[PDB]
Amino acid sequence: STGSATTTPIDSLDDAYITPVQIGTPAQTLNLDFDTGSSDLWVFSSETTASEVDGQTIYTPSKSTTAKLLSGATWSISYGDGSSSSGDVYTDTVSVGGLTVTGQAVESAKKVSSSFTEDSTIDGLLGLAFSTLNTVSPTQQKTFFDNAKASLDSPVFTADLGYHAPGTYNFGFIDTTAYTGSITYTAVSTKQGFWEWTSTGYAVGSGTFKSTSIDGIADTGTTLLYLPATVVSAYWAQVSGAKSSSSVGGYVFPCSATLPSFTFGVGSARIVIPGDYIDFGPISTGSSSCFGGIQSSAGIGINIFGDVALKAAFVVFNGATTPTLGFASK
Numbered sequence: 001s002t003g004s005a006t007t008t009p010i011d012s013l014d015d016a017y018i019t020p021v022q023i024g025t026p027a028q029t030l031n032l033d034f035d036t037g038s039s040d041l042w043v044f045s046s047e048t049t050a051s052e053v054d055g056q057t058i059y060t061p062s063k064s065t066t067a068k069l070l071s072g073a074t075w076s077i078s079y080g081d082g083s084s085s086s087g088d089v090y091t092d093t094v095s096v097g098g099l100t101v102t103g104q105a106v107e108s109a110k111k112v113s114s115s116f117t118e119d120s121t122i123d124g125l126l127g128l129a130f131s132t133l134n135t136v137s138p139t140q141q142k143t144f145f146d147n148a149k150a151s152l153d154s155p156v157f158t159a160d161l162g163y164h165a166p167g168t169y170n171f172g173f174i175d176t177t178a179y180t181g182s183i184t185y186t187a188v189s190t191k192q193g194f195w196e197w198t199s200t201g202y203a204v205g206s207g208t209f210k211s212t213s214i215d216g217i218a219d220t221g222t223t224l225l226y227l228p229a230t231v232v233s234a235y236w237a238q239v240s241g242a243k244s245s246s247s248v249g250g251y252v253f254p255c256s257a258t259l260p261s262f263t264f265g266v267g268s269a270r271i272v273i274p275g276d277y278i279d280f281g282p283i284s285t286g287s288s289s290c291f292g293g294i295q296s297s298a299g300i301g302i303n304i305f306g307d308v309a310l311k312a313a314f315v316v317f318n319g320a321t322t323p324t325l326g327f328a329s330k
């Protein structure tokens with residue numbers, strides 16, 4: 001089997017991407033944030049504290065003839081941005097772009113933190129990291145990809161995120177029309193539960209490439225690119241007037257600037273992020289200070305190849321017995 005679904009930016013900045021997902025019988029369609037940096041599929045629901053729902057579409061398990069309470073199971077997750085959610089668990093039928101999993105753990109939120117409530121466009125998350133990070137207790141649950149894998153034509157999914165435009169998540173096949181050149185594959189460590197790999201270096205604009213190992217994670221659920229402070233300083237030094245602001249929480253730059261590109265290495269191959277992809281707009285409405293899309297990872301403990309980096313590439317998440325990651329230009 002295969003599946004193919006369009007993913008759409010939630011706003012004009014590409015802060016996140018939503019993909020329609022069918023849950024239950026008859027189908028209830030929710031728009032989920034596919035997150036290769038976590039491993040829980042959770043949704044706003046009829047059980048969510050009413051004051052914490054503000055415009056989201058909810059899953060109502062009592063209206064699904066295939067929903068079953070997973071007795072005794074609870075979940076609770078806290079994300080790197082400080083947001084969180086928790087609740088109980090049902091199993092139900094879940095379909096993405098024509099690909100159907102029966103018996104998928106659907107984690108129903110009883111509580112969500114303010115940032116989820118305040119984002120009316122995201123009805124939940126669909127985790128695509130390794131199932132060892134799933135938070136369901138006392139019996140850990142598998143991701144949608146792990147449950148589908150045996151049925152797929154090939155044990156892979158691909159992320160093709162758009163810049164200010166829709167893109168695609170495919171499951172079970174590699175669309176050879178969706179990228180240019182060849183796909184360069186690179187080793188993955190699953191030891192932390194993430195799609196963790198080592199970039200071979202970077203360049204700023206037309207500058208020379210610096211060969212240096214940068215260990216980080218491919219994370220569709222993080223907006224920006226988070227890299228070591230040395231690398232980030234070298235980038236922003238090429239932008240007149242750019243500075244790190246503790247009050248804002250990162251590097252800012254004059255909105256009048258033209259940003260240089262940023263290149264990262266994948267083996268001997270190179271992925272070029274155009275400068276415009278690094279502009280996240282005014283820090284507050286009407287400001288002439290703009291927020292940068294490349295930020296330091298120094299306070300995080302890990303480097304994160306988020307959407308800023310991933311949307312410059314066609315990315316293969318290869319879930320073979322020995323997982324790997326593939327990157328192609330597009």
Ligand SMILES: NC(=O)c1cc2ccccc2[nH]1
Pocket residue numbers: 037038039076077078079080133135
């Ligand atoms: N137990 C947790 O709060 C938790 C698990 C996890 C996995 C990926 C990303 C964030 C996460 N938070």
